[PDB]
Design a protein around this nucleic acid. Structure first.
Ligand SMILES: CO[C@H]1/C=C/O[C@@]2(C)Oc3c(C)c(O)c4c(O)c(c(/C=N/N5CCN(C)CC5)c(O)c4c3C2=O)NC(=O)/C(C)=C\C=C\[C@H](C)[C@H](O)[C@@H](C)[C@@H](O)[C@@H](C)[C@H](OC(C)=O)[C@@H]1C
Ligand SMILES: N[C@@H](CCC(=O)O)C(=O)O
Ligand SMILES: [Zn+2]
Ligand SMILES: [Zn+2]
Lengths: 50, 293, 130, 1099, 152, 116, 95
DNA sequence: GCTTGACAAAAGTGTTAAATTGTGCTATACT
């Protein structure tokens, strides 16, 4: 994963309402993601939880 | 002893009347400046309040003289005028010093010359210079004895005027204005240009305190990745340089004579033996010892 | 005090000097420190062996070999040039001063030995139990 | 331990802490609570102590009450000070640049004796700064700390100094009061030539009494026979003319001279400390003066006991100024109290004089009272005072040591440059009171220290230490805090001594400390008190060094000073091998969130954490998130609890900057290899695995604050705007409407943060500049561009913006219309050149960072993270770093002691339940009770999974590493393990400077140093010496003429380099031209002469 | 000094100074120490006069003038601090120490500084009279050999 | 009024007793000559000399006198008409034409980088 | 020049001090509290020490480099570079 | 290439009103 975009936050050093992890500590966790892309040409994933 | 002073005035044309002043000189304003800082508030030299006390008391004296005034009053003024000029020249040399707010003594004319902060030691026997820099140092075990690792960012600024001309000679930039901005924003073209200007152009590397002349040595600069300076491990003895966080200053010799002196007199590899005992200094040490042993 | 001392000429030509011990009585034994007293000097007069054998001529660099050669002839003292006896009008002369510790050769004529001396003395001051 | 949420960290201590570590912040709080004297302090003194507790404010108010002039016709009485609720909250103050304070009111009584009237008027003294929960103050928005000062307690101190002239003994005495002239034996107020007998006649005592009281004193009788002063009034004259030279005396002035100087309470202030010191050792009256002389006489004679009419017998002996019995600490409350007294004494002057010229009966407390000097004292103390210090907060520890710091400097104590080395030396009475190991390395050695762990300050200013008294070889549970004086009276058994089952001295003999101090033995019968525990002498920082006992005081002192310098990381991992203080020091720092009522969590969010107590009440805690610290470090907090969790009073709810699960985490645990490696880690340098960059293990966040204001100029009004006179539309691409950087943008060195413009006067453009204006039609703008840009060599993201406008109601100083502050933050990866270190004083820069591929890696394929050189270890005497390197591996892989048939012999000496520990379990080795050498070896061989059942480290702490470049094993076994290393606040990004040309000083044309001004380096005297030794004249001349001071030469040389021409010849240094001018201003005619063309002019 | 003469004091002072540095294991060649010692014995006291009694005058400056073709002194040992203050350069002595003292005596004596010493030249920005700054070196003239210009 | 009451501070004051740094030596010299600008200005002065070479002898002559390039003293339309012997309006005309000629991209493209 | 032979000192006489002076400063006034401009006859007086801006007199009737070294008949300031403000000295005649 | 008259903005001058600035003064008795 190269970059990420979260709606409410404009940068990395803020928090999200209701979330227990700050944005910077969430990215730390996301670094552990092991993904495999069988296609060239950057592809965007999506995540939405309520 | 008394004859020494009396004799001095004879041979010299100085009239001994000079020791009493009829007129007092006023120093140029820019040497006693009054300027406003960022925000509007003002700051000024202490000499102006000192000059202000003298002028006030002298003018007040004229006032009392003209009206006619008992000696007690007039003599009191002359005594005050005398002390005012004393504080102007050497404040504190007689009696308590003239103080400002916070009870800190004002700076007299003598206070400009004397001390480690005076003109001689501060602004005359040493001074801050252009074309210089510094940073923390790291080991350079892969360097040749005559070389040193120089942070590319640091080198770019040091040689800024040089690269500006080179990239204008080449069509990279059309005018000097474009050359300046092309370096400030660090467009990728300059780096290839920086290697050329830096080639065989020596620099001086100093670490304080400078104990012997070996505390300053010339080296051939090498662009290095990172913001630290790579130092040859054999010159640590001379610089007494520990890699526990020490820093070193870099100076850029400009004139042909200055570069000649760097390459010839101060070059790293030409200075090996200490100029005190003749013993070798760049001799291997501490790791190279046990490594060869 | 010594910043104005600089080599001003090659030779003042004076015959004056000082006597270095360089050995004593042995065996019946180089002096403890001939490296800082005798070496790097220049001979003021010819070192004559116990006859007219003169073994080293005046004006010799007095390196490591010359001291061993001299010791063989059994010379227990030597008269040498020194800046203390130099008669130069301004500064000192190369011959009196002697070899330059950094170059290993006779001091160049521009050298400012005054400052180099002050620094060579002060720099180790940090290592002196005061 | 005994902390509800305390994590499980096994300890090797063979003792049991009989007394918990007291609240390490009390020294700052109790002092302030005494000053304000709130009910929490009232109950303290009432329960056990005096029955008339007096708050510091009341105490100083009693001195003023009442006010009365020479006529005594009108009196003004002060009483009953009151405080209102705090104006604004601490968080609001730090945001609005105001000072956290509470208004103070007083009762002002004005009584006219002639009219017998009463004008009672409530008076407003001013906003009185209040102390926060963390023992700090908010002064004009910034958090500050008032350090406690060391001073010589007022009293009578004697000293015996041998005179070389007579080669005989001599005795001199000194009496230092709270205020007033000091005397020395006569030597009074720097006036020598005084016969001590003449003053005894000054009081009026006849010579007969001298022969009566002096008695056995031989020189006492011989001096009065030598003195030519005849009469009591004549001696007062011989004392008068020398004390007040130039003033003809009078019988009315000569007699009141002596009384007013000392006996009168006004000019000679009896100190509660001094009044107590001498009253027992022997306000002012003759009784104290004659007692000193009688004390001095016996000291020179040699008798150890002195008694006089109606006096208690006391020993006649010299006193030690450095003994903590005579050296006290001036805590914050007292430092404030003294500055209030100075304000009242300055107001008293206006109160007294105002009465005279004011219309009688038309004056009131409000008219006579003027609080300008009272509030000025407070305002002038918290700012500009040497003891009111900008709080040091790189981490919770650095702040926790700033408070508890003890200073000998500042007003009222010896200054930095003058003090001799005798004070700096450690003293026997420093045990358990002031840590001897924690002190500056530089010129302030011995003058600055931190309060010990169990130390406690006395209401009189003397430090006390906790002890457990022993009676008949049995150590009771009675714990008595003793001052230094009463400590020497008794014998102090050693903290660790064999304990007998229910309590009794088991060892045949016991370690003891004497008043020498001396170390001796007894059979346990003559001991009185024992040490509460080891590390009494140690401070908080010192007590956090594992294996402290093994490292030399030199490297330890460096180890303590460097903990303060660490920086909070993003992950903030706790130490794998630590001591007992880790968890206790974090909570007492204040940077951790603790729950004050038992209950359950209602919500948990990054923003706040709410708890529903059993009491039904509801507490909530707002979390500091990415708050810029005083020194730029990140003060972020993170919650460590879940929603349904139960909690107990005093538990840890969220972690602070450098804390994990409640304990201090100043660094990370790393895999260490102690082999020398290819000359890259050499001379204290270090090499790291590139893993430490990819995984952000040593990453830390730093935040800057940039500020710009728009004020009213004589030529108009500054306007913050997006319009800039001459700029591209691209440079403004990140600016919003108002002209301030948009939140979330990236900023590069030289970028614009806040656009500002100021009016311009009388442009008068150059003709070449006006022609282009007509050609390209860009109308010359009426205002110059003074805009806020990012400093050189600085970059980051824009976190937040704070705008204060004048249009909006907000508060600003007269002339300032709009003030905007921009906060930039950046993630700093661990970079080569950054300074790392361990707790043992071992420090070094990052020499190189290798790819994880080519690095000494264990047979597992597990690359080591750091490679430390072997040579710097042995000679420095810090071997603890090797011990924790072994233990660090033990705690990482686990272990299991052999249950085979029984406990081996090495575990026989009280390791309990420590036989087995899983992988990654943390360990705690208290400094002087920690693990021992034998126990280490036995553990070195222990549980052996990596994943497969193969060991990776032998019983010597070594392993066979494979070179990652050649791929072949290293010939010998290398020591590996895990060490705790910290990231220090010395970073390359901040320390790398470079300059070609830049600003120049105004008076002197030299470049102005410092990175803030983009300045150049200083080529100093010593450097010029080295340049001269080389014989490089042109290099030396260049540095001093065209590179700094030559106003015309420096612009030519630049012109030459740009054109490729030859560099021109240097000119005259502007500084020298200034010298001749400054010499002329002294009436010194300095003429620069030619060889034959006499006079030259510099123009 | 008064007992064994000037040339013997120097031998003593060098031995003493060299003994302290030998106790700490420092190797300094005697010549360096000699350069410093040489500066303490450069002057002599004037017992009788052009000159005044009790004054410390340079040895060389005392011989040429004393002759006056058709005034006795004794060798003087003085410390480095006192000696360096007696330097002929007044602005050199000023920047060194006791500036006010030096300036007042220089103005009364109406002193003139030739600007020969190397510190004086540093202050005013001149080329120090040492190393490459010496006359023979800085006045070197360089041109290619006629045989070289031919090869072009 | 509250701005008038402000009193100045001492340049010889020591900012921070910690570092013996005198406030005075932290003050820039705003009127100091900047090397890069004066050099570029010198280069700009040359580039204009060339551009005017393209213009006619009277076209350039009027431009120089109008802005006072040679003397540094600008001249009014009437005064320039007094040297060339024409009315001020004729000079106003010659001005507009030479300015549109200077605005011609061939001559202006080189001077663009000198905006500021 | 950069090459001088001798540098000499000597007691400055009252005449030497007067010859150095470009005028007597008679008032202890620095600058006007409103216009912040140098007060005449005081310390910083442009009439004595020199102009604040290059080739500009106090009132400004002569603002161009066209006439250098001329004094404005109104304000009395000389037209020249403000560098002289750093080179010129005044004096005080003591009563 | 260029000039003429009408014309309005811009720049100076002189004349006045408002403001700013300097100075004198205050009488129970007070040292
Ligand atoms: C008004 O406050 C000032 C008064 C000076 O006057 C003067 C002469 O009287 C002083 C008193 C009475 C002190 O008790 C004192 C001190 O306890 C201390 C340092 C040492 N300071 N340095 C630390 C090391 N670094 C290499 C250099 C600076 C000091 O210099 C002083 C000090 C002075 O110097 N503490 C140490 O060495 C230790 C064990 C830790 C330091 C932590 C941080 C760094 C500092 O606490 C920062 C946060 C500030 O708090 C201070 C720097 C204050 O500066 C300001 C602007 O706030 C200073 C107290
Ligand atoms: N330049 C030296 C003298 C040069 C030389 O030795 O010839 C002086 O002046
Ligand atoms: Zn010689
Ligand atoms: Zn004018």
């Amino acid at each position: 994963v190269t970059s990420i975009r979260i709606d409410g936050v404009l940068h990395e050093f803020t928090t999200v309402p209701g979330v227990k992890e700050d944005v910077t500590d969430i990215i730390l966790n996301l670094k552990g993601l092991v993904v495999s892309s069988d296609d060239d040409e950057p592809v965007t994933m999506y995540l939405r939880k309520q | 002893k008394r004859l020494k002073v009396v004799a001095a005035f004879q041979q010299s044309g100085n009239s001994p009347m000079g020791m009493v002043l009829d007129a007092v000189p006023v120093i140029p304003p820019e040497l006693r400046p009054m300027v406003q800082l960022d925000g509007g508030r003002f700051a000024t030299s202490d000499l102006n309040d000192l000059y202000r006390r003298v002028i006030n008391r002298n003018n007040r004296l004229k006032r009392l003289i003209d009206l006619g005034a008992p000696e007690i009053i007039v003599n009191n003024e002359k005594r005050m005028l005398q002390e005012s000029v004393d504080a102007l020249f050497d404040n504190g040399r007689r009696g308590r010093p003239v103080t400002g707010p916070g009870n800190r003594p004002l700076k007299s004319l003598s206070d400009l010359l004397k001390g480690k902060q005076g003109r001689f030691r501060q602004n005359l026997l040493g001074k801050r210079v252009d074309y210089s820099g510094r940073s923390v140092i790291v080991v350079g075990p892969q360097l040749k004895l005559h070389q040193c690792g120089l942070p590319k960012l640091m080198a770019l600024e040091l040689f800024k005027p040089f690269v500006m001309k080179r990239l204008v000679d080449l069509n990279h930039a059309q005018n000097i204005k474009s050359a300046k901005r092309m370096v400030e924003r660090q467009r990728p073209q300059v780096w290839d240009v920086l290697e050329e200007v830096i080639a065989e152009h020596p620099v001086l590397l100093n670490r304080a305190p400078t104990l012997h002349r070996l505390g300053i040595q010339a080296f051939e600069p090498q662009l290095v990745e990172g913001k630290a300076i790579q130092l040859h491990p054999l010159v640590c003895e001379a610089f007494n340089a520990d890699f526990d966080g020490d820093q070193m200053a870099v100076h850029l010799p400009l004139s042909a004579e200055a570069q000649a002196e760097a390459r010839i007199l101060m070059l790293s590899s030409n200075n090996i033996l200490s100029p005190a005992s003749g013993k070798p200094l760049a001799m291997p040490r501490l790791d190279m010892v046990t490594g060869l042993y | 005090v010594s910043q104005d001392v600089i080599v001003r000429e090659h030779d003042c030509e004076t015959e004056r000097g000082i006597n270095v011990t360089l050995a004593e009585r042995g065996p019946d034994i180089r002096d403890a420190h001939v490296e800082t007293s005798a070496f790097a000097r220049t001979l003021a007069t010819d070192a004559v062996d116990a006859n007219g054998n003169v073994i080293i001529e005046r004006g010799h660099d007095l390196g490591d070999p010359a001291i061993d050669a001299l010791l063989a002839a059994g010379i227990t003292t030597v008269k040498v040039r020194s800046v203390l006896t130099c008669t130069s009008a301004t500064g000192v002369c190369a011959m009196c001063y002697g070899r330059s510790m950094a170059t290993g050769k006779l001091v160049d004529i521009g050298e400012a030995v005054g400052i180099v001396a002050a620094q060579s003395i002060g720099e180790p001051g940090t290592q002196l139990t005061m | 331990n005994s902390v509800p949420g305390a994590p499980n960290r096994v300890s090797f201590a063979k003792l049991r802490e009989p007394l918990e570590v007291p609240g390490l912040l009390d020294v700052q709080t109790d002092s302030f609570e005494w000053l304000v004297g709130s009910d929490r302090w009232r109950q303290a003194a009432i329960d056990r102590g005096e029955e008339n507790p007096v708050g510091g404010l009341e105490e100083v108010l009693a001195e003023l009450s009442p006010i009365e002039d020479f006529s005594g016709s009108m009196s003004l009485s002060f009483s009953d000070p009151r405080f209102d609720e705090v104006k604004a909250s601490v968080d609001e103050c730090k945001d609005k640049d105001m000072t956290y304070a509470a208004p103070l009111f007083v009762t002002a009584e004005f009584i006219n004796n002639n009219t017998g009237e009463i004008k009672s008027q409530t008076v407003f003294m001013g906003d009185f700064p209040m102390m926060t929960e963390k023992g700090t103050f908010i002064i004009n928005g910034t958090e500050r700390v008032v350090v406690s000062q060391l001073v010589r307690s007022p009293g009578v101190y004697f000293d015996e100094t041998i005179d070389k002239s007579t080669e005989k003994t001599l005795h001199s005495v000194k009496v230092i009061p709270g205020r007033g002239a000091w005397l020395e034996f006569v030597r009074i107020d720097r006036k020598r030539r005084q016969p001590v007998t003449v003053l005894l006649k000054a009081l009026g005592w006849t010579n007969e009494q001298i022969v009566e009281r002096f008695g056995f004193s031989e020189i006492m009788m011989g001096t009065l026979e030598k003195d030519t002063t005849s009469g009591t009034d004549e001696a007062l004259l011989d004392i008068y003319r020398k004390l007040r030279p130039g003033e003809p005396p009078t019988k009315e002035s000569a007699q009141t001279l002596l009384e007013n100087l000392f006996f009168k309470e006004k000019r000679y202030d009896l100190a509660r400390v001094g009044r107590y010191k001498v009253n027992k050792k022997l306000t002012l009256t003759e009784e104290d003066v004659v007692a000193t002389i009688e004390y001095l006489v016996r000291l020179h004679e040699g008798q150890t006991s002195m008694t006089v009419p109606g006096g208690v017998e006391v020993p006649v002996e010299v006193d030690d100024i450095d003994h903590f019995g005579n050296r006290r600490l001036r805590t914050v409350g007292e430092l404030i109290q003294n500055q209030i007294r100075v304000g009242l004494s300055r107001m008293e002057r206006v109160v007294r004089e105002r009465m005279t010229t004011q219309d009688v009966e038309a004056i009131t407390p409000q008219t006579l009272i003027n609080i300008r000097p009272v509030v000025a004292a407070i305002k002038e103390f918290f700012g500009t005072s040497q003891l009111s210090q900008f709080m040091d907060q790189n981490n919770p520890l650095s702040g926790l040591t700033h408070k508890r710091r003890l200073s000998a400097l500042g007003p009222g104590g010896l200054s930095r440059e003058r003090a001799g080395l005798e004070v700096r030396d450690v003293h026997p009475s420093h045990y358990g009171r002031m840590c001897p190991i924690e002190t500056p390395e530089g010129p302030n050695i011995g003058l600055i220290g931190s309060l010990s762990v169990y130390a406690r300050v006395n209401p009189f200013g003397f430090i006390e230490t906790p002890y457990r008294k022993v009676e008949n070889g049995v150590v009771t549970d009675q714990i008595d805090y003793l001052t230094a004086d009463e400590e020497d009276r008794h014998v102090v058994a050693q903290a660790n001594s064999p304990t007998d089952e229910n309590g009794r001295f088991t060892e045949d003999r016991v370690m003891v400390r004497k008043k020498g101090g001396e170390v001796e033995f007894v059979s346990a019968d003559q001991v009185d008190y024992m040490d509460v525990s080891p590390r009494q002498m140690v401070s908080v920082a010192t007590a956090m060094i594992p294996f402290l006992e093994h490292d030399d005081a030199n490297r330890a002192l460096m180890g303590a000073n460097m903990q303060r310098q660490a920086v909070p990381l993003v992950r903030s991992e706790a130490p794998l091998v630590g001591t007992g203080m880790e968890l206790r020091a974090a909570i007492d720092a204040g940077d951790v969130v603790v729950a004050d009522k038992t209950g359950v969590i209602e919500e948990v969010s990054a923003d706040y954490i709410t708890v529903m107590a059993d009491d039904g009440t509801r507490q909530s805690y707002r979390l500091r998130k990415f708050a810029r610290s005083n020194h730029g470090t990140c003060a972020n907090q993170r919650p460590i609890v879940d929603a349904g969790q139960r909690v107990e009073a005093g538990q840890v709810i969220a972690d602070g900057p450098c804390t994990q699960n409640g304990e201090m985490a100043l660094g990370k645990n790393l895999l260490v290899a102690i082999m020398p490696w290819e000359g890259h880690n050499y001379e204290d340098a270090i090499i790291l695995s590139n893993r430490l960059v990819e995984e952000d293990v040593l990453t830390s966040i730093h935040i800057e604050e940039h500020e710009i204001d728009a004020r009213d100029t004589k030529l108009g009004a500054e306007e913050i705007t997006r319009d800039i006179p001459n700029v591209s539309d691209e440079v403004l691409a990140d600016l919003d409407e108002r002209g301030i950087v948009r939140i979330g943008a990236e900023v590069r060195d030289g970028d614009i943060l806040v656009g500002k413009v100021t009016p311009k006067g009388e442009t008068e453009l150059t003709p070449e500049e006006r022609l282009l204006r007509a050609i390209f039609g860009e109308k010359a703008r009426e205002v110059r561009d003074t805009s806020l840009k990012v400093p050189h060599g600085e970059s980051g993201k824009v976190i937040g913006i704070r705008v204060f406008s004048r249009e909006d109601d907000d508060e600003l100083p007269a002339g300032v219309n709009e003030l905007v502050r921009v906060y930039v933050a950046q993630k700093r990866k661990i970079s080569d050149g950054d300074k790392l270190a361990g707790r043992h004083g071992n420090k070094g820069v990052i020499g190189k960072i290798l790819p994880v591929e080519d690095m000494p890696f264990l047979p597992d394929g597990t690359p080591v993270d750091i490679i430390l050189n072997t040579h710097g270890v042995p000679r420095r005497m810090n071997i603890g770093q090797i011990l924790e390197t072994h233990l660090g591996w033990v705690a990482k892989a686990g272990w299991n002691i052999d249950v085979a048939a029984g406990v081996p012999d090495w575990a026989s000496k009280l390791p309990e339940e420590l036989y087995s520990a899983p992988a990654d379990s943390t360990v705690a080795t208290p400094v002087f009770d920690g693990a021992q050498e034998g126990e280490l070896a036995g553990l070195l061989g222990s549980t052996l999974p990596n994943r497969d059942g193969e060991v990776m480290v032998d019983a010597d702490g070594k392993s066979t590493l494979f070179d990652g470049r050649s791929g072949e094993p290293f010939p010998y076994p290398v020591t590996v393990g895990y060490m705790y290393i910290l990231k220090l606040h010395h970073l390359v990004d901040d320390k790398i400077h470079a300059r070609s040309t830049g600003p120049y000083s105004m008076i002197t044309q030299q470049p102005l140093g410092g990175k803030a001004q983009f300045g150049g380096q200083r080529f100093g005297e010593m450097e010029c010496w080295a340049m001269q030794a080389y014989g490089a004249a042109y290099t030396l001349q260049e540095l001093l003429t065209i590179k700094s001071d030559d106003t015309v030469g420096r612009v030519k040389v630049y012109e030459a380099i740009v054109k490729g021409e030859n560099i021109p010849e240097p000119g005259i240094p502007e500084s020298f031209k200034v010298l001749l001018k400054e010499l002329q201003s002294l009436c010194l005619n300095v003429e620069v002469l030619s060889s034959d063309g006499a006079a030259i002019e510099m123009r | 000094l008064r007992v064994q003469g000037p040339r013997e004091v120097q031998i003593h002072l060098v031995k003493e100074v060299q003994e302290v540095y030998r106790a700490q294991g420092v190797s300094i060649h005697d010549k360096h120490i000699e350069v410093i010692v040489r500066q303490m014995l450069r002057r002599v006291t004037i017992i009788d006069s052009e000159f005044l009694p009790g004054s410390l005058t340079e040895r060389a400056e005392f011989e040429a003038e004393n002759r006056r073709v058709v005034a006795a002194g004794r060798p003087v040992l003085m410390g480095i601090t006192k000696a360096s203050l007696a330097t002929d350069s007044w602005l050199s002595a000023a920047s060194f120490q006791e500036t006010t003292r030096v300036l007042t005596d220089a103005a009364i004596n109406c002193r003139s500084d030739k600007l020969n010493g190397l510190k004086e030249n540093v202050i005013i920005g001149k080329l120090i009279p040492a190393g490459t700054g010496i006359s023979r070196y800085r006045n070197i003239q360089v041109q290619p050999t006629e045989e070289a210009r031919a090869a072009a | 009024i509250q701005q008038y009451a402000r009193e100045p501070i001492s340049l010889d004051q020591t900012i921070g007793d910690e570092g013996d740094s005198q406030l005075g030596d932290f003050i820039e010299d705003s009127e100091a000559v900047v090397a890069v600008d004066a050099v570029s200005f010198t280069l700009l002065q040359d580039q204009l000399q060339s551009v005017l070479e393209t213009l006619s002898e009277r076209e350039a002559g009027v431009v120089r006198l109008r802005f006072g390039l040679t003397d540094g003293q600008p001249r009014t339309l009437d005064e320039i008409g007094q040297v060339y012997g024409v009315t001020r309006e004729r000079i106003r005309q010659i001005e507009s034409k030479t300015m549109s000629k200077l605005r011609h991209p061939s001559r202006s493209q080189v001077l663009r980088d000198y905006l500021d | 020049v950069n090459f001088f032979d001798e540098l000499r000192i000597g007691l400055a006489t009252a005449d030497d001090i007067r010859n150095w002076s470009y005028g007597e400063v008679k008032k202890p006034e620095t600058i006007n509290y409103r216009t912040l401009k140098p007060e005449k006859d005081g310390l910083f007086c442009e009439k004595i020490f020199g102009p604040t801006r290059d080739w500009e007199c106090y009132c400004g009737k002569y603002k161009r480099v066209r006439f250098k070294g001329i004094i404005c008949e109104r304000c009395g300031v000389e037209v020249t570079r403000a560098k002289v403000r750093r080179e010129r000295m005044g004096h005080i005649e003591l009563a």
